[PDB]
Amino acid sequence: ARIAGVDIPREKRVVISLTYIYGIGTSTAQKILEEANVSADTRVKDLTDDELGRIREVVDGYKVEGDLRRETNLNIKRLMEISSYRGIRHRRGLPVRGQKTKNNARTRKGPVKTVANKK
Amino acid sequence: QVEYRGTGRRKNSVARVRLVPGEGNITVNNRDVREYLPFESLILDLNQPFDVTETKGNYDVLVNVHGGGFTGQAQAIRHGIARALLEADPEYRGSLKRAGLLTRDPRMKERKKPGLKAARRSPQFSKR
Amino acid sequence: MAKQKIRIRLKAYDHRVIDQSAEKIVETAKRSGADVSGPIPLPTEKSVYTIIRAVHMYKDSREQFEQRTHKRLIDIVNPTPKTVDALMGLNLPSGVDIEIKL
């Protein structure tokens, strides 16, 4: 469904409506609004069929799709399959660069358990 | 014709007021009072000089000014006014000095010393 | 603006030595000519150097310093080789930094 990809809410404005699609944010959305010449008007999905088709076919322009999730999959999984220290820190909340984990448990691993071996 | 002229000092600002006899209509930097103040509707307080002194008014005005936010220079306006109305006649001082509006408010900012940082807050202690 | 002219700049770190020296070179300027310009002031730039009274620690109790720098500006019209000598004749005392110019 319905106007593009999957999972759009009805009766919502375009500039936000086209972002629940996994693959678009807020600016590239505005770009595809600039291609098919559509816009909100006003807080709500006014898109009648005559615009629906053009958005329905223009939207193929990008990855958007779950294929982006698979793209991420083979990216990270390749990244650990090869050697690799980058996968080891792909488990540690540490990108190829670094973030200095001492308080970086609660971004990944939900501070529970708390247990301190001081001193 | 003839006009009077006194400066305006307040709050890191400087105003050069030019007091010309007239009906009262004011354009700082050749620009109207409304055209210069956000929002602002406390402008009658700059006409506080005209209610107590030169009652009710009025004189047309010209002025040039720069430095500091809108408030402190909007109230730098007042001092060259009162001074200039005393240039006209020292009659007007008696109702002014029982109201002020002329003592160029000496207070302004304060230096820092350790405790204040990127915004103005002094520090805490180490608890527990 | 176009005109025959001499202009210089001085610099030093004391208003008394600089302004008495200015009195010298103005006096000697119009001594050998005319049309001098007075000792025109300048904003007198500054500096700062914040340092901790410390060897090891205790950054809270900091300390400052500074280096004021007077600046002075003089001009003369209708040059001549004599007021030249009034420039390159007397700077004294010599904490000053003259840069004779046109």
């Binding site: - | - | 770190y13 004391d14 500054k46 340092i51 009274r53 400052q64 310093f65 500074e66 280096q67 004021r68």
Partner: protein, 60 residues
């Protein structure tokens, strides 16, 4: 130690900056100014002497 590090930051170098600009007399690197190349304490304890120009202090 500090003694051979004087020699370290004195010699030629492979390229532009492996350098550090440390204090002439005091062997401290840190908290040094390029204007004077004097460290933290040393500029102060000389600043009191009435040696470098100049006032110093307390107008800001």
């Amino acid at each position: 130690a500090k003694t051979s590090m004087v020699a370290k930051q004195q010699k030629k170098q492979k390229y532009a900056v492996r350098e550090y600009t440390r204090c002439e007399r005091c062997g401290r690197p840190h908290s040094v100014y390029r204007k004077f190349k004097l460290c933290r304490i040393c500029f102060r304890e000389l600043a009191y002497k009435g040696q470098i120009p100049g006032v110093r202090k307390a107008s800001w």
